[model samples]
Structures are given as structure tokens and as C-alpha cells.
Target: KYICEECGIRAKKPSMLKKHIRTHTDVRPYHCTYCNFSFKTKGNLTKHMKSKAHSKK
Candidate 1:
């Protein structure tokens, strides 16, 4: 497996490099362990985890 220098996203082959280059146009893959909330990006998920709402959950 080749790791992307950009986001640490991994690619198993050259064709996958093409597949991995696109950003954001995907279903939210980040899930909250305590709730049904999900976010499109890990950055958003990290931010959400920092909020008071997440603490309460």
C-alpha cells in the first residue's frame, strides 16, 4: 500500500491514486460513537467532539 503524502490517505495501486484524489463529494464517513451524528470530514468530526454537546452525550 502506498500512503498519500497529502492526507495520509492510503492507496493500494495506481488506479486507486486516481480514486483517492477527489475530496469531499462523499457520504459522511466520520461517525459519533455516542450518537447518530456524522460528518463528511474528520476535521468536522474532531471539531464536533470538542463541543459541549458531545460532552453531554
Candidate 2:
């Protein structure tokens, strides 16, 4: 697991480096536990997933 020194993005190869950059392009991955709202990037989904606002159910 190679970690990006600049941003902490993890990748195994140059192709993966390019893929990790797509997270910026993906930009929005908000998943709503209360409703049917979801975004595209897992990183964007991270905070809410960590928050108490969204239930684990």
C-alpha cells in the first residue's frame, strides 16, 4: 500500500495514482443514512459515516 506523501492517497501504481486523483473529480459522495441520498466518492461519504447524525443502520 503506497501512500501519497502530499495527500495521503493510497495507490499501488501509476495507474492507481491517476485513479486516486479522480476522487477530486468525483468530489461528492455524501451518503444519507436517514434517506436515499448518496454521493459518488467514498472520501466524501467518510465524514457523515463518522458523524452521529447518520445512524449505523
Candidate 3:
């Protein structure tokens, strides 16, 4: 498991922990394929793709 020393957040998967660490640093590396949008997590990127706000492009 991966643990965040700053927030005590735990994740069984390494990728999950890496994403969780972004919450502390505000690092958004996941970018959209259709736009200039990016997200802190893959889940948010997926959600943005489905939302109408993403279609404004």
C-alpha cells in the first residue's frame, strides 16, 4: 500500500497513491485529448470528457 505522510491517505495501488499525492501539490498531469483541459486525477478527466462544459470547445 502507498501512504501519504502529509495527509495519512492510503492506497493499495501505487497509481492511486501517486494521484493522491497530487492533492497536496496541486499537480495535474492528466490532459484531455480533445481540449486544453487537464485534471488532477484520471477520474476527473473522465468526468470532464462527459460533461457539457468540456464540449464548449
lDDT of 3 by residue, 2-52 (tens): 899988987979889887886666477898887776777689887887887
Each prediction's TM-score against the native? 0.44, 0.38, 0.41
Candidate with better TM-score, 1 vs 3:
1
Ranking by TM-score: 1, 3, 2
Least well predicted 10-residue stretch by lDDT in candidate 1: 17-26
The residue pairs in collision within model 3 are none
Model 2: weakest 10-residue lDDT segment is 22-31
Give lDDT: candidate 1, residue 57: 50
Report every candidate's CA lDDT: 0.72, 0.66, 0.78
Candidate 3: how large is its RMSD? 4.8
Best by TM-score, which number? 1
Q: Mind giving the per-residue lDDT tens digits that candidate 2 earns over 1-57?
A: 566666898787977887666645545456566766566656656666777776656
Q: What TM-score does model 1 achieve against the real structure? A: 0.44
lDDT tens digits, residue span 1-57, model 1: 666778888787877766666543466679887888777679888788888875765
Residue 39 of model 1 has an lDDT of: 70
With a 3 Å backbone cut-off (N, CA, C), the pairs that clash in candidate 2 are: 29-39, 29-40
Candidate 1, which segments miss by more than 4 Å at Cα? 1-26
